[PDB]
A paper describes a structure:
Focused refinements on the LSU (50S) and small subunit (SSU; 30S) of the ribosome provided maps at 2.9 Å (with the core resolved to the Nyquist limit) and 3.2 Å, respectively. We found one base to be differently modified (16S rRNA m4C1377 versus m4Cm1402 in E. coli and T. thermophilus) and one to be unique to M. pneumoniae (23S rRNA m1G783 versus unmodified G750 in E. coli). In addition, the C-terminal domains (CTDs) of ribosomal proteins S6 (residues 131–184) and L31 (residues 47–100) were better resolved in the new maps and could be correctly modeled. The proteins L31 and S19 form the intersubunit bridge B1c in bacterial ribosomes. Interestingly, the 20 most C-terminal residues of L31 (an extension in M. pneumoniae compared to other bacteria) reach even further to contact protein S10, thereby strengthening the intersubunit bridge. For instance, we modeled a number of naturally bound polyamine molecules, namely, cadaverine, putrescine, spermine and spermidine, as well as magnesium and potassium ions. Polyamines were shown to bind to ribosomes in in vitro studies, and are important for stabilization of the ribosomal RNA (rRNA) structure and for translation regulation.
Chloramphenicol (Cm) is a well-studied ribosomal peptidyl transferase center (PTC) binder and growing evidence suggests that its inhibitory action depends on the sequence of the nascent peptide. Here, we use cryo-electron tomography to analyze the impact of Cm inside the bacterium Mycoplasma pneumoniae. By resolving the Cm-bound ribosomes to 3.0 Å, we elucidate Cm’s coordination with natural nascent peptides and transfer RNAs in the PTC. We find that Cm leads to the accumulation of a number of translation elongation states, indicating ongoing futile accommodation cycles, and to extensive ribosome collisions.
Numbering used by the authors: 8 to 121
The structure:
Amino acid sequence: NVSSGIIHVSCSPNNTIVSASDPGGNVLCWASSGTMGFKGSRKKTPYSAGIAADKVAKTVKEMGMATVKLFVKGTGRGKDTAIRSFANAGLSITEINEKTPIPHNGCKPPKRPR
RNA sequence: UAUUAAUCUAGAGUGUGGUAGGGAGUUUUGGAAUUUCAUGUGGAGCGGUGAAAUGCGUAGAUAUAUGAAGGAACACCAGU
Ligand SMILES: [Mg+2]
Ligand SMILES: [Mg+2]
């Protein structure tokens, strides 16, 4: 019932999440590779991210919005598959802002696996 | 060569004039980010891996927005 909104596309290296939300807080729908039905390691493939983006795009288009600001987050692999899925869905993409957390040399990261 | 009695400025210092620095200690201040807590939206997974399983989750997790608390370290500048 709202024309403009935000789409948070978080791409973890292990999984992906797409949350369609009102311009200020109050997420309106959400989807992820797990809710798609993919399980285990298949959740981290770009195709699963595209599937999740397509489902959420169809859902929110039937809900009836037009303009989307796409907030890209994380450092996965299928970071652009969701972008192309939304573009193919056809919602008016206005902004491509990226908001993956960057630190200013605070907090100690985990150990390096070997 | 050593000792003694002296002179000299070229070694080494001192003064005046230019001057570059993440040199050191003490006392205040700041912003990103993680975590926890509080309050809204939401509804089945999240997390993790070579693949999974312990684990967290309908007592409403992951996500999203706002606020508070505290701790540690100070992106970019940053380098033939
Ligand atoms: Mg590790
Ligand atoms: Mg916050």
